[model samples]
Target chain A: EDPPACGSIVPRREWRALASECRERLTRPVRYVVVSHTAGSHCDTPASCAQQAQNVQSYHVRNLGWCDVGYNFLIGEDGLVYEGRGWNIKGAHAGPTWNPISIGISFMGNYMNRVPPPRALRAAQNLLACGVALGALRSNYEVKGHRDVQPTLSPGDRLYEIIQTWSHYRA
Target chain B: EDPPACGSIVPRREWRALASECRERLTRPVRYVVVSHTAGSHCDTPASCAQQAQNVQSYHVRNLGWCDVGYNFLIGEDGLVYEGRGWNIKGAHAGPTWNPISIGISFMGNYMNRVPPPRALRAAQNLLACGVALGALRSNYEVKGHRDVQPTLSPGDRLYEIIQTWSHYRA
Candidate 1:
């Protein structure tokens, strides 16, 4: 649940839980979780406004051919977690094998412009803990940020630094 | 996670953690999550997989000087997630803005021969789940296999079908 760049404020309420039996059948031995920040949104400024974030979802989906959101979960600058794809099935978030076995999460603003809120980090932790409880995890885990996935300043140097030492691997 | 045809089992251990953060960090909002399956590696089966995957990442990072691995994440048949640039940051994965705020996840095998393992699908779920939790999602958090990303039958049709119902608004 700890991504290199994730914070606690975001909240992911599992509105509809996947049946344990269903989840069990699909459970993969997850060893680590990868994550990244899209320094592109850069909407931290009020000028970007709420409306700026509007139908952005629909736009991306229709043009991209994805289900809903690429991620299984989404977070707003306000730190609210919106449901993207339902949690039970495979996600069209990443490349083939990667998506099927992995869980994806993201924030809705550009963290490069400002410091990431601690609230978001907390939310990530909660979600990760939930994964562990669900028996989807292995002992060793990592909370990497997008930067780690690829060698880019994705989460921004600032936010990436903050999350590096924030979350300890949990069993 | 798993590929569209296979189940859960992708993004080997170390790589998964790095992607966890890429999916998070909403401030940067990612648009799409592209992926490939059974791509040849630079070393093994180094022809096609190596060329497309390595070339894309290298160009995104070296020529573009954006960073490394333009795609959001990567996985090998060995089930490892290699580091790719996170979403939100411009990438050499596809065209410019076309994929700047997107996450590309790839698999290291040639899907033309067969379907991904079930474990691959699960891994895909975990990878995307992390993105959903963060919330900086764009439109389609599509977990599309390679064929969708490229012009060829890279990942194949049999596997791609599994993801047909999950697109947000595929092009």
Candidate 2:
């Protein structure tokens, strides 16, 4: 629809995403939500995270030569969700298998040794709720950390431990 | 495996649990942990809460004519955990669909207008960590207030607000 009525999501225009040329739409009621972290710079303010979002997209599109950002959404320590490819478009977040079947949400920080602020986590869950409400995510969706399906330390150890306690997590 | 090694849990023997007849088992790496509040009574001391735990079990088994205590674990303001149906049994706390898939954890008090002490919250979270450690809970388990899946003011308004801010809460 329009700017979603759930979570504090900064729309694509807010982050100034490049024009999307990707046309692959994910199947509705997607089953999995893959959580990850940029593992790069951590941003705590709306302005800084917005700039960070631009940077992430630049890496994906400009350097990696992808059509758009790698994740469907990006969470900032500012307690805000920045729309990336949004809900419909498939993202290149968790490899080919997970990308087509899951909505990728990455946090804007390196959480290996530190935990994100409580507000940042609250925003991420709220964003997932929005996806469910809009019929983009299945009501029985499962949450998976970046390392659950792959051999990477993504999302981060602290963040990974946090997600493991979530209701929808499978592994 | 043996019980997990996180929070301190008073066993059924210590709490003097009645002969529970509940036999249904929940699949391991369970996905949800439902939080509730016993609107019936509150206990602030270990002995009182232990008695309260027995009282709850009596109500569920003798009065309600079900298997055992409805919840998997019970929390006390005294900052201790009391085992109920435990990690293996399916709890009847959150209705049918959820009962089979989640662990039901209740606070031994009314939280409508009150909040649990920081110690109590800490104990509950520690218990969750223990669940993860023992593989009783999924690494990506989700947390829910009873009201999220049921049609009642459980866990209490105040407690509900507090949990809404939890990292694992999805609704």
Candidate 3:
């Protein structure tokens, strides 16, 4: 069966998202998904994660001067999903080429040596399924680690390893 | 009932919203509606308007680092309603105080020097009545120009004046 639509995210308001001004659009039924991690502190509670979401966006907006937070969606170790640029707009997470064609989902913390909680893992996997259900992603979408397409140590080693064994993982 | 759900709004999925990331929720039977405009480009056809919607959300998420587009619903000169944040979640179109208490409806394009077409005008008013029908808005929901509560010229001088004549408009 197809996955249900992304019905579980904590909407931007709940997380107190700042206003953004990005204007790029990604082609739908996107063929790839790029997974990454913030490489920052992990938050496992709603109160803390909400603050973390704001912090991440602040860095992108204030420091990076990017249009918005780079990821399409951010998953918290607390098992909650924080909305980023979302599915429609192209993200600044992955490299230029990859960012345009893929939906980028990032775990909201460092995972080079740490694995995310089971609920966090479930939320990420489920989000992929939801993308397919909403037709935002191809049914055969490929998932790649941040390092797979970029030269950086994004998504962290631990996350890269776990995603490597996922059913949708590709070279 | 709820005016048949805004009469053909493009679903967030249709517009490719990233995922459900909003955290706060507005209690239904909302009493206020905040009207504004994109002050960007205007689209008249469905295909073009859809792209406009994507562009708007992109600016909000990518450029502004917002969780999603700030308005609850975005109206198009295309004669169709493009969903922004929609009914359930509070929007960011207004300042903090109004964002929590009102549904913001933003028209696509700068209406300061120009007025929207007849269809677009009809659509905005219709959406208000529809909200009342669906019980998401109060039966006597009050409409306020964005400038009424904020310091900016938002809904546009021309459009803002027109809304003043609507039965639901209050100050």
- The numbered model that scores best in lDDT is 2
lDDT of 3 by residue, B1-171 (tens): 111133345667765666546777888879999999988998765556778889888888888888888899998775557777888898988889889889999999999889987656755766776577568888778989999998998889998889899887898
Question: For all the predictions, what are the DockQ values?
Answer: 0.03, 0.02, 0.02
lDDT of 2: 0.83
Query: Worst ten-residue run, lDDT, model 2 chain B?
Result: B1-10
Candidate 2: the clashing residue pairs are A164-B139, A164-B140, A164-B141, A165-B141, A166-B141, A166-B142, A167-B141, A167-B142, A169-B140, B37-B155
* lDDT by residue for model 2 (B1-171), tens: 664123356778877899888899988989999999889787765567779999999999989998999999998775567889999999989888899899999999999989986546766876786687679999788999999999999989999998888877888
Tens-place lDDT digits, model 1, residues B1-171: 332423232232322221222232223556576555433332233234334455555544454344345455555433333445543444444433336546666555545446566655556555666566555454345455444543234344555665555544363
lDDT of 1 at A21: 17
lDDT: the better of candidates 2 and 3: 2
Q: Model 1 Cα displacement at B79 (Å)?
A: 40
> Which residue ranges in model 1 land beyond 4 Å of their true spot?
A1-26, A38-56, A168-171, B1-92, B95-171
Question: Candidate 3: misplaced stretches above 4 Å?
Answer: A1-5, B1-171
lDDT of 1 at A81: 49
Chain A (alone) TM-scores for all candidate structures: 0.64, 0.96, 0.95
TM-score of chain B of 1: 0.58
Q: Give the Cα lDDT of each candidate.
A: 0.48, 0.83, 0.80
